[PDB]
């Protein structure tokens, strides 16, 4: 039976990383957040002022407003049988840029490089390039032939039991 404190059950959650105490990097306060970005809430116990509630720890949210010192973040919270929208205002020390769209932005960039080539190619009248193939779950690999010149065989059989004492 725990208590109803604001920071209950935080012996391990709010502990600093091993050999990671003291000041934070200057990239945390220098990184520029724009409205619409994706950020991850990461409570920093070393800064007691403005510490976000521990339930929002590790939640990926979107930036909805940028203030002189605080970055508004919009995350989803689960209630009895519904989902509500929580709007916060955290200092940059307690957040971190999110890489949730890291690979998506490579596929957005690759299709734009092809499209920029296609418009030019149509200007010269030459046939245009095809769009990149979509990602697929690991497909059944096709048949193949193995050259036996550089192939060695090792027999596999159950092993005689050997005592570990």
């Amino acid at each position: 039976p725990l208590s109803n404190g604001r920071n209950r059950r935080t012996r391990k959650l709010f502990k600093r990383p091993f050999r990671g105490h003291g000041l934070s990097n200057t990239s945390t306060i220098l990184h520029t957040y724009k409205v619409g970005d994706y950020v991850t809430i990461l409570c920093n116990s070393s800064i007691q002022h403005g510490l976000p509630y521990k339930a929002f720890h590790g939640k990926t949210g979107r930036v909805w407003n940028v203030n002189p010192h605080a970055i508004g973040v919009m995350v989803n919270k689960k209630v009895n049988n519904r989902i509500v929208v929580k709007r916060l205002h955290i200092s940059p020390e307690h957040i971190k840029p999110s890489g949730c769209q890291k690979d998506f932005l490579e596929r957005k960039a690759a299709v734009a490089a092809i499209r920029k080539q296609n418009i030019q190619l149509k200007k010269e009248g030459k046939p245009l390039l095809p769009l990149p193939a979509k990602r697929l779950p690991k497909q059944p690999r096709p048949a193949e032939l193995i050259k036996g010149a550089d192939i060695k065989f090792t027999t596999v059989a159950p092993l005689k039991f050997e005592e570990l004492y």
Binding site: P137, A143, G148
Partner: protein, 210 residues
């Protein structure tokens, strides 16, 4: 007026001839590859199957919510119900999760032929209409270049470009009963039980089930 019936009949034969050409040509190419590999002393690795038929083995009582959702995603909502499923990383993991409730394997062409011809049906206007003519197949799957029952059989077996649209139109098959296992359906087929991946041995079960 009704002269299109003769033209449609001729067109179906043209498609049927073409489909059997593709199936037989690929069958030959594999056979010679194994033959030539033995001549050269090399090793030939077969291709993994791309098609899987799964049968629901157990009832609707006592299923965890995670398993209940997966069986609904595969349209196995009733005991003794078979559907065709593409093989990839996603589906194989899903079938492993629901292993105690399904038995599955790789069908042969004759297994696909008999299932579609005898137990085949289509969902037209929300009605599970059984297959009785090519016109009803042309109406439902004309936009997908499937105008006869042999295109339907060939597309399922080879998993063509429009497998998803063709497969999703085919209502889940309702099968008979058969001797499920040797010991019981409470153990994996590897142990002699009923559920699990039977590989090509699922055709013996389907023989008594269709």
């Amino acid at each position: 007026c009704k002269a299109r019936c003769q033209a449609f009949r001729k067109e179906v034969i043209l498609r049927t001839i073409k489909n059997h050409k593709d199936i037989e040509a690929a069958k030959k190419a594999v056979y010679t590859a194994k033959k030539n590999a033995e001549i050269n002393g090399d090793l030939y690795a077969e291709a993994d199957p791309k098609l899987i038929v799964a049968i629901r083995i157990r009832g609707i009582n006592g299923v965890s919510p995670k398993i209940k959702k997966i069986l609904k995603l595969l349209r196995l909502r009733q005991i003794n119900n078979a559907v065709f499923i593409k093989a990839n990383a996603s589906t194989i993991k899903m079938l492993r999760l629901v292993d105690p409730y399904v038995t599955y394997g790789y069908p042969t062409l004759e297994t696909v032929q008999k299932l579609i011809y005898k137990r085949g049906a289509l969902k037209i206007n929300g009605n599970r209409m059984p297959i009785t003519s090519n016109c009803m197949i042309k109406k439902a799957l004309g936009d997908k270049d499937v105008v006869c029952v042999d295109d339907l059989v060939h597309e399922i077996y080879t998993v063509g470009k429009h497998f998803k649209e063709v497969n999703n139109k085919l209502a889940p098959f309702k099968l008979n009963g058969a001797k499920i296992a040797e010991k019981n359906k409470k153990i994996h087929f590897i142990l002699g039980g009923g559920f699990g991946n039977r590989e090509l041995l699922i055709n013996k079960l389907l023989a008594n089930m269709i």
